[PDB]
Nucleic acid binder design. Structure first.
Ligand SMILES: [Cl-]
Lengths: 152, 147
DNA sequence: CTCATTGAGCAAATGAGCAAG
DNA sequence: CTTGCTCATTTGCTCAATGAG
């Protein structure tokens, strides 16, 4: 129901694309996030990084913010990592989540019947998860950048 | 009415039983209404839905037939919902399409006319809830006594 | 008058699909 | 293959008429 404004969304998305490129290269200290460390264990040592990545300071700050906000919802954290860190597309994530989808009570069109959600529902849910993650991350990251600019 | 969990249990059982019946594993001698219903379904068909075994299928068939043999209209609705898979809205629309004028006396000045689709939806909802409420205890006792 | 019933319709959810890039 | 859309169907829920008690 709640989304970010266009400017806030594009800003946070640029930052998160840079941060995901930085994380996927293996420059994040494993101690800074157990979730991201476990996610990185299944990545090949020799990687081809053709995406822009931020510096190490910004990477560390963004990682702190993302870990502090997303460690509660491990599913959304994993989706966020697959999208920004690994670079998978929303369609591919929705496809994987449609393949391994437990039957659920589908409503309205589904007649409140238990059945596996359609691919369209999985696409919508992935979009919703990403938008909600960004909506919650925005203010924390903004305040972090502002406090870094002030204290320094 | 039934509790949420009782309804979920009975609805799962009836969904499996409807898939089983739609596959044609029920003997015609077990229920004339179900046989008449199966006469009007496309013979060569794919299923792709989970169904119970034959013992549970026959038990549920006996229960539903003993409970629903009185109201053939409600029996047909139940079969259309669980066996054929039609939705409540589709059933209400089909019965609104084929609805003879009736004496409506609330909105409408007691004039003979076709009942609105809203009333058909309500009637379908009311019929399904009553069928499940009447079926639940019989099926529970049947499953318990089979052992 | 009070209120249950009918007629009418809407927002949200879901499934399926499509065209441009 | 991806993405952002359109279109149709189902459900539960309101709201206005309208007549019985
Ligand atoms: Cl069940």
């Amino acid at each position: 129901e709640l989304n970010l404004t266009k400017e806030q969304h594009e800003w946070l998305n640029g930052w998160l694309e840079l941060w995901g490129a930085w994380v996927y290269s293996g420059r994040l200290e494993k101690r800074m996030s157990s979730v991201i460390a476990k996610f990185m264990e299944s990545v090949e040592p020799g990687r081809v990084m053709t995406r822009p990545m931020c510096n190490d300071d910004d990477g560390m700050l963004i990682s702190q913010v993302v870990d502090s906000v997303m460690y509660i919802d491990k599913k959304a954290f994993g989706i966020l990592l697959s999208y920004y860190a690994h670079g998978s597309s929303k369609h591919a994530i929705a496809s994987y989540y449609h393949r391994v989808a437990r039957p659920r009570k589908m409503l309205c069109r589904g007649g409140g019947r238990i059945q596996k959600p359609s691919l369209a529902t999985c696409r919508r849910e992935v979009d919703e998860i990403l938008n909600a993650s960004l909506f919650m991350i925005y203010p924390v990251l903004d305040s972090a950048f502002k406090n870094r600019k002030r204290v320094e």
